[PDB]
Write a protein that binds this ligand. Sequence first.
Ligand SMILES: *[C@@H]1O[C@H](CO)[C@@H](O[C@@H]2O[C@H](CO)[C@@H](O)[C@H](O)[C@H]2NC(C)=O)[C@H](O)[C@H]1NC(C)=O
Lengths: 6, 246
Amino acid sequence: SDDDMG
Amino acid sequence: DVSFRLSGADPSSYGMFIKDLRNALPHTEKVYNIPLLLPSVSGAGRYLLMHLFNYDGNTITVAVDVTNVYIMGYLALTTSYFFNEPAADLASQYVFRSARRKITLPYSGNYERLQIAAGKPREKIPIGLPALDTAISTLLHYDSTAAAGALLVLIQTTAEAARFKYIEQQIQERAYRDEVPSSATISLENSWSGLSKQIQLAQGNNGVFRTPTVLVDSKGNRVQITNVTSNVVTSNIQLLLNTKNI
Ligand SMILES: *[C@@H]1O[C@H](CO)[C@@H](O[C@@H]2O[C@H](CO)[C@@H](O)[C@H](O)[C@H]2NC(C)=O)[C@H](O)[C@H]1NC(C)=O
């Protein structure tokens, strides 16, 4: 559901 | 078959490929509006062939088990390569029949064995579209150690992005620059089997999971999923592994 990078 | 070309690839054409791959997978029903993969398929119908083209236009054909989206093996020129596992050997008698030689890789296709063979956990391997281009290139010239690392990238950018919208979006962000996967990405990959089962047996139980699943979110914060109402279920997971195969 969430998002960006890591 | 499904196809993806890295020459001129952008976030949008990658998205179209991930969409093509999803509805190339057969299902009879949906559980909470998510396609449920079949318990089994007999013969050559059990396998999907993905043709991948690197930037230079070289190609490999990857065979995918449609009941679980596991990669069984791949064809690079006139050589086929299959994981050292019973599923992949069954697969070998249906796909890549015309290969001049068949090599069995010295490992099975699971993350744990692939990581040992690679010498690196997948936390430390950058992924993205550039990585995928590299992975394709590495695979057409046999080298078992490099192949383990290339397969860890290939699995994540194809199979895992098909299973989760989040991971597809992660890869779209890495269209022109590789980056190691977030913690969330790794816990999702690790929880697919568990989440699939809890979503399935939530359906006679008012959408409530028999056992909560523990994930990690974007901010690296530990979270507990207890029912089908969560964003993971409504807006993330795209395919369910049938409980027969769990
Ligand atoms: C489904 O999941 C949601 C989100 O985790 C649960 O939300 C909680 O609801 C209870 C009671 O309604 C509140 O005490 C909590 O504060 C809520 N948590 C959050 C993070 O907002 C919801 O309860 C679950 N549904 C069922 C039927 O158990």
